[PDB]
Amino acid sequence: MAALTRNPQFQKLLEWHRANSANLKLRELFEADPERFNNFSLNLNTNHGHILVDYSKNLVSKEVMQMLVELAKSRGVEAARDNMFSGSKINYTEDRAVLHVALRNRSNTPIKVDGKDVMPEVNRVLDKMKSFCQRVRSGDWKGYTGKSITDIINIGIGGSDLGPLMVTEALKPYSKGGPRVWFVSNIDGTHIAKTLASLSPETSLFIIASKTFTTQETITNAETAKEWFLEAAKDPSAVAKHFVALSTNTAKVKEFGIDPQNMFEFWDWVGGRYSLWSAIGLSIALHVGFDHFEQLLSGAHWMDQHFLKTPLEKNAPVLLALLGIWYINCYGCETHALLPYDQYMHRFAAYFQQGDMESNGKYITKSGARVDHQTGPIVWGEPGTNGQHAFYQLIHQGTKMIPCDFLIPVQTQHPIRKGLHHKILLANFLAQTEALMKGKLPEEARKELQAAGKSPEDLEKLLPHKVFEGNRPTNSIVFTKLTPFILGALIAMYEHKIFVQGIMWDINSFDQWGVELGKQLAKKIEPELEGSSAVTSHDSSTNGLISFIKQQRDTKL
Amino acid sequence: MAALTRNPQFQKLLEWHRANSANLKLRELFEADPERFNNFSLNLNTNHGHILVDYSKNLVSKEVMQMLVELAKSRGVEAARDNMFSGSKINYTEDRAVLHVALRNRSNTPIKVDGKDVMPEVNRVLDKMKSFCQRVRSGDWKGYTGKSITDIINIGIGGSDLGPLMVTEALKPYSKGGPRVWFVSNIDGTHIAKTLASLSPETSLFIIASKTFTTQETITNAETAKEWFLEAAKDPSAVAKHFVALSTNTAKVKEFGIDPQNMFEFWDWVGGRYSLWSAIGLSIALHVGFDHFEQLLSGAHWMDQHFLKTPLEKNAPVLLALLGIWYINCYGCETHALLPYDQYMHRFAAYFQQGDMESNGKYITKSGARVDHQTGPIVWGEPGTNGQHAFYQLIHQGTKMIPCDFLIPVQTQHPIRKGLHHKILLANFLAQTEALMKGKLPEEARKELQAAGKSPEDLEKLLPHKVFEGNRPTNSIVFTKLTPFILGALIAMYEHKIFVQGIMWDINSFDQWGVELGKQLAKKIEPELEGSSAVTSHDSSTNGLISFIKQQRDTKL
Ligand SMILES: O=P(O)(O)OC[C@@H](O)[C@@H](O)[C@H](O)CO
Ligand SMILES: O=P(O)(O)OC[C@@H](O)[C@@H](O)[C@H](O)CO
């Protein structure tokens, strides 16, 4: 088997689930224990707002939580965490440290990789970012015709795109005095084309974001941007005023036409999906200002310290991790829904699709043995209240068990109409988890049908359709306000949740070998699409699709 | 039990799956039979472009497909379809017809509800839409200060939002000479606030989209918009120049204060999640023009006729539906991924999240029995290639089986760099499904690592992580170009897929009693948030969360 399934605390947990889980009913759990919310929630005081992690509406008893905490301990979570924080090369398949926590290490306590403290270089690049932010935001940095920059365009994909996009979206109210920010990511030429259409070469600065600086998508997009720019500027020396790089490839960066002084470096121990805290977050810092960027880092640092110092039984990311293990490995739930009741957070779910799924969508353990159990879930969601009208039908009355995290700020950035909108938003946030837990009993629906004037025949027919089984578990995560600091803490919380789950599964949360095959096969297909000659080199489906493409590409509609 | 599980053809199918499914290997199926693509694909000629539905990379044989078609006949799919198209009241819980097909019935063949042809009223509303679009788009329609309209704002949620949003996004290239379009949907005050900040009351036209015209989010947003408007206009008669309604509720529209001639009617047999084809599509028609809206309707009509007249074994929506049944009810896959290789299609997956999940996230059958089998899947996805750099890691190397539909137009709307971007996009589209099918055997990975120069030690350490198990089934849906017509055909195709699955599960695809409950939920909590007094009326979690909101709402950050 694998490490997890061979673990006696896991075996005990699974056996307990088999014997007892049918006895777990949320309604009864709350009725039996008025201290339930008190015992199954964490009210975190960060000194910059509170984060309440309410996990009480979960299918767990005190005994289940105890078993889960014991499993985290017996899977080596505490030791593994310490190894991450100390710079051990815990990314074992690539032999790399995993040090996104160093990027936001505000305390400046030394963190060594190969005997050398990484903090000086972290802080050097942060200083460079700050200076660049002053130059651009003040208008001192001029374009090729001597005008201030009005638009920043990040070009990047995956980890070089999602974090900066999600965070600038989430922190939009903090962007007064900042340039507009645009994100180009898809190779689909629609993306860059529609972006450039609304821009002036005179006042636009491009940020080329690539860990490797070889990703075909990003480099192609970057070269398209440069071609468009040079059409107007007609001077290759002007490129240095309008293009900067987030990478380490000094030669290719210089060859591109970017001043080596405008390469913002990061390191191999910064995973792409953990990179917004590094140089990769330059578009964030430009948009909301460096002070706000530091606040974002400080919130993450607070959560790092919470994760590092707190006993597991009261440790927020650990508890979130453990509830997920319970639903994944015991109940067999494929998915995890992230439902922020916040329009600014509209890209939060998409961000953690990479963060979670690229981390823990794995099947090989540290020993090299295949897992014989589930790993990472499929992450999904849209902001409330919209989902209530879209897919909550299935959550309430479908045939899937779907753990959901509901998230909301107490204070809105836009308290319009004396707080009316936010009052309604909050009421929906609360009522939905309440309804998911409670459902609606036959006796309740029956009386409603009788009051509505339904005939005995119609009532009988309609009744089962109007009943809600309930017993659908949720987390409610509520926080004072979505400030840069609080957002930083929340992202870090999920980062550490993902880490804990990965350790427990005995997988590598920090590599991504699964992207290689698709890349290989695409490089082979690319040149074959040119010209009218038949392609016969693949399976008949791939060949047939290529044939269709060749046949249909000249058709006038 | 339930109709599906009681069905002998289903039990036959499932027994076959038990005994034989482990012997289906895609790589081997393709090697053994060069005709596989030909035997498991449909090349549809619409006379306005081709749609290739290539289902050959699925874990199916001739025998499997035979059994699935036989099950569809046994479950009465054809009869149910005919009943929908004839105006039978197949939404049995609400006693309503289900006639989105009437909305786009270009033939004008009578479709009767209660002995009355619905087509005259369908066409009367379409003619009203056409006339209105001409007046606004031409600049003839003037605001309260005598200026042409520059911005249109749709206010609606769920079915009154997602269709118009998705389609205007997908058909963006067709919007030259149309007003800018905005979508406000969330009750979250951020949504309306940030929209209004960018608008002038003098040149903005609001479209209040709501079937019932009582939905809290929509009516509140509408009232906020009206208050903002009237603060500038200071004249109730000016509202008629700036507010129109799309609804079935004449009285509530009048009550809100909208001109009777400013109401675009639809009917109870138009489901919200099937409503973009009706008056609800006004924002589409305003943005891209009525002619393009008519093309969209015409594409849907073509697909309707395909569904109606084609033998099950060559019927595109039927086959997609049956492959879904196979993966859901035999393999137990919770989810279905929609992955369009098209940035304009970036809201397509979210749209069918509603269309699918709100339709088929059900657990009561026509007979009143609780299902003892799975119903609708969780639908999710992001456009390619971004997905590859977000979550494809899990699709390739996770522990979940995930049926994926890959979609792409052959012709791009933006053939920049002499088609270089689209070449790369197509290459990735093709390679990914090839990769998911083929995988990479241990011996194949071994040879690659050996050629890379890895020592016996390093090779052995890395090997298992580099293996791709493959056998991951996909659909590839390729179409000449994403025109209004082709988009219409594609949406209708999935609508009918959803219909077929619903009939086979014996559920009502057309009600939403879970959604209706939602609209009854927040009302009790709303007044309890006002004031400083402690709430003790609910379970301790709801109480505790309310206490947190009250404690945290005055804190200064
Ligand atoms: O930052 P570069 O090297 O372009 O790579 C982009 C993505 O492929 C990368 O983030 C990947 O998803 C791993 O996190
Ligand atoms: O259109 P109204 O009645 O406002 O309803 C909004 C949504 O609840 C509705 O579209 C729902 O998504 C059902 O399809």
Single-letter code of the amino acid located at A483: T
Pairing of the two strands B50-54 and B474-481: antiparallel
| Residue A100 known to be catalytic | no
B385 chain-A contacts, CB cut-off 8 A: 157, 186-188, 217
Q: Least CB-CB distance to B57: which of A193, A342, A541?
A: A541
What's the CA gap between B364 and B508, in Å, rounded?
Answer: 8
What's the CA gap between A168 and A180, in Å, rounded?
Answer: 10
Which residue(s) pair with B479 in the sheet? B51, B409
CA distance A322 to chain B (A): 19
A52 reaches B (C-beta below 8 A): yes
Exposed e or buried b per residue across B452-471, where buried means at least 16 C-beta atoms within 10 angstroms of its C-beta: eebeeeebebbbbbbbbebb
Q: Whose Cα sits closest to atom 4 in ligand 1?
A: A210
| Residue B234 known to be catalytic | no
Q: Which atom of ligand 1 is nearest to the CA of B389?
A: 12
Pairing of the two strands B378-380 and B335-340: parallel
DSSP A252-291: HHHHHT--GGGB----TTS-GGG-TTSGGGHHHHHHH-HH
Strand spans (E) along B156-198 = 180-184
B357 chain-A contacts, CB cut-off 8 A: 390-391, 393-394, 398
Q: Least CB-CB distance to B468: which of A37, A361, A517?
A: A517
B257 reaches A (C-beta below 8 A): no
Residue A346 CB neighbours (<10 A): 19
A541 reaches B (C-beta below 8 A): yes
Of A406, A401, A469, residue with least CA distance to A433: A406
B374 reaches A (C-beta below 8 A): yes
Q: Report the first-to-last Cα separation within chain B, whole angstroms.
A: 57
Angle (deg, nearest 10), helices A62-74 and A8-20? 160
Angle (deg, nearest 10), helices B540-552 and A416-438? 160
Angle (deg, nearest 10), helices B119-137 and B290-309? 150
Q: Which atom of ligand 2 is nearest to the CA of B247?
A: 1
Strand spans (E) along A417-515 = 474-481
CA of residue A213 to ligand 1 center, whole Å: 9
Pairing of the two strands B41-45 and B50-54: antiparallel
- B residues 103-142 closer than 8 Å to A (CB): none
What's the CA gap between B157 and B159, in Å, rounded?
Answer: 6
Given A202, A358, A422, A497, which residue is catalytic? A358
Angle at B411 between CA B313 and CA B167, to 5 degrees: 75
Given B73, B389, B423, B447, which residue is catalytic? B389
CB-CB under 8 Å, A34 with B540: yes
Q: What is the resolution of this structure in A?
A: 1.7
Give the number of whichever ligand sits closest to the CA of residue B210: 2
| Bond from prior residue into A385 cis (ω within 30 degrees of 0) | yes
What's the CA gap between A138 and A515, in Å, rounded?
Answer: 41
Structure-token pair, residue A316: 């927020």
Angle (deg, nearest 10), helices A62-74 and A77-85? 50
Exposed e or buried b per residue across B121-145, where buried means at least 16 C-beta atoms within 10 angstroms of its C-beta: ebeebbebbbebbeebbeeebebbe
What's the CA gap between A219 and A256, in Å, rounded?
Answer: 10
CB-CB under 8 Å, A465 with B52: no
B466 chain-A contacts, CB cut-off 8 A: 513, 516
DSSP A158-194: GGGTHHHHHHHHHTGGG-TTSPEEEEE--SSHHHHHH
Contact B241, B143 (CB under 8 A): yes
What's the CA gap between A495 and B73, in Å, rounded?
Answer: 49
Strand order in the sheet with A243-246: A180-184, A151-155, A204-209, A243-246
Q: What stretch of H or E contains B44?
A: strand B41-45
A489 chain-B contacts, CB cut-off 8 A: none
Given B169, B202, B265, B358, which residue is catalytic? B358
Residue B532 CB neighbours (<10 A): 8
Fold match between domain B100-294 and domain B516-556: no
CB-CB under 8 Å, A478 with B385: no
Residue to test with chain B: of A25, A188, A331, most B Cβ within 10 A: A188
What separation in angstroms does the CA of A150 have from each of A142, A153, A167, A176, A242?
A: 10, 10, 19, 12, 12
The three-state secondary structure class of A52 is: strand
A353 chain-B contacts, CB cut-off 8 A: 382, 390-391
Count of residues for chain A? 557
Residue A83 CB neighbours (<10 A): 16
Contact B27, B437 (CB under 8 A): yes
Q: How many contacts (CB atoms, under 8 Å) link A and B?
A: 516
B45 reaches A (C-beta below 8 A): no
What's the CA gap between A500 and A503, in Å, rounded?
Answer: 5
The three-state secondary structure class of B467 is: coil
What's the CA gap between B104 and A121, in Å, rounded?
Answer: 63
CA of residue B210 to ligand 2 center, whole Å: 7
CA of residue B214 to ligand 2 center, whole Å: 10
CA of residue A272 to ligand 1 center, whole Å: 5
Residue A98 CB neighbours (<10 A): 23
Given B48, B50, B519, B538, which residue is catalytic? B519
Give the number of whichever ligand sits closest to the CA of residue A160: 1
Q: Least CB-CB distance to B361: which of A394, A433, A514?
A: A394
**Residue A11 marked in a binding site:** no
What's the CA gap between B218 and A328, in Å, rounded?
Answer: 37
What's the CA gap between B380 and B437, in Å, rounded?
Answer: 20
B365 reaches A (C-beta below 8 A): no
Site residues for ligand 2, CB cut-off 6 Å = A 389; B 157-160, 210-212, 215, 218, 271-273, 358, 512, 515
B441 chain-A contacts, CB cut-off 8 A: none
Pocket test of ligand 2: the residue of B93, B187, B210 to mutate, having most ligand atoms within 8 Å of its CB, is: B210
B531 reaches A (C-beta below 8 A): no
A49 reaches B (C-beta below 8 A): yes
What's the CA gap between A70 and A56, in Å, rounded?
Answer: 19
Q: Which residue of A has its CA nearest to B544?
A: A37
Domain boundaries, chain A: 1-99+295-515, 100-294, 516-556
Residue B421 CB neighbours (<10 A): 25
Q: A73: exposed, middle or buried (C-beta count within 10 Å: 0-12, 13-18, 19+)?
A: middle
B466 reaches A (C-beta below 8 A): yes
Which residue(s) pair with A395 in the sheet? none
Q: Least CB-CB distance to A30: which of B396, B465, B539?
A: B539
Q: Least CB-CB distance to A371: which of B334, B394, B399?
A: B399
CB-CB under 8 Å, A187 with B421: yes
A271 chain-B contacts, CB cut-off 8 A: none
Which CATH class for the B100-294 domain? alpha beta
CA A127: distance to chain centroid?
26
What's the CA gap between A229 and B430, in Å, rounded?
Answer: 32
What's the CA gap between A455 and A461, in Å, rounded?
Answer: 10
Handedness of CA A311, A317, A322, A325 (dihedral sign): negative
Exposed e or buried b per residue across B379-416, where buried means at least 16 C-beta atoms within 10 angstroms of its C-beta: bbbbbbbbbbbbbbbbbbbbbbbbbbbbbbbbbbbbeb
Q: In terms of CATH architecture, what is B516-556? A: Orthogonal Bundle (1.10)
What's the CA gap between A64 and A72, in Å, rounded?
Answer: 12
**Beta carbons within 8 Å of B334's beta carbon, 6+ residues apart:** A334, A335, A378, A400, B374, B377, B378, B400
What's the CA gap between B298 and B295, in Å, rounded?
Answer: 5
What's the CA gap between B293 and B429, in Å, rounded?
Answer: 29
Given A176, A234, A389, A465, which residue is catalytic? A389
What's the CA gap between A70 and A66, in Å, rounded?
Answer: 6
CA distance A529 to chain B (A): 7
Exposed e or buried b per residue across A278-306, where buried means at least 16 C-beta atoms within 10 angstroms of its C-beta: bbbbbbbbbbbbbebbbbbbbbbbbbbbb
Of B521, B525, B527, residue with least CA distance to B543: B525
A417 reaches B (C-beta below 8 A): yes
| Residue B519 known to be catalytic | yes
Site residues for ligand 1, CB cut-off 6 Å = A 157-160, 210-212, 215, 218, 271-273, 358, 512; B 389
**Superfamily for domain range A1-99+295-515:** Glucose-6-phosphate isomerase like protein; domain 1 (3.40.50.10490)
A557 reaches B (C-beta below 8 A): yes
